Amino acid sequence: YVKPGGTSSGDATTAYANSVFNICQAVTANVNALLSTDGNKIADKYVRNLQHRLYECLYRNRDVDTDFVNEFYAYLRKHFSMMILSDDAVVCFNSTYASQGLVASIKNFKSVLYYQNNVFMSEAKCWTETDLTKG
RNA sequence: UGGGAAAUGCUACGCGGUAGUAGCAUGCUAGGAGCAG
Length: 135
Prior knowledge:
By secondary structure, the chain is mostly helical.
């Protein structure tokens, strides 16, 4: 037969490929969440200036810009920490930021998967934990 | 007339080598089993 696509199982680099794909999904959810917030009601200038610079570096500038890449990566490390196995993830994220939609949430992931993978994540499958004593 | 070396044995000490014994740690290999995505 002819396999249209998708990963096989019996090769040697499946776990690493899935991990990279997972990280890409998370980062693009964060980018989408940040750019769809009205800039007239943001917090201290820093983040709103960051949003402006982000749109510029995304759609206007042609080649790569190293410093802003470093800055955004540092921001993500500050407010969005991930531990990643092959397609299994746990995220510890600042809640007050996600309240105003400055970082990801489950609705952003649902939208990203719907338009980038052609599957519909049902929110009854994910889980959200408020306490930190229990892991 | 206020001058002494070696060959033998004993004992003690240390080193070296040899063997045997025991312990410790590790590195490899092989075998078998279990868990996870």
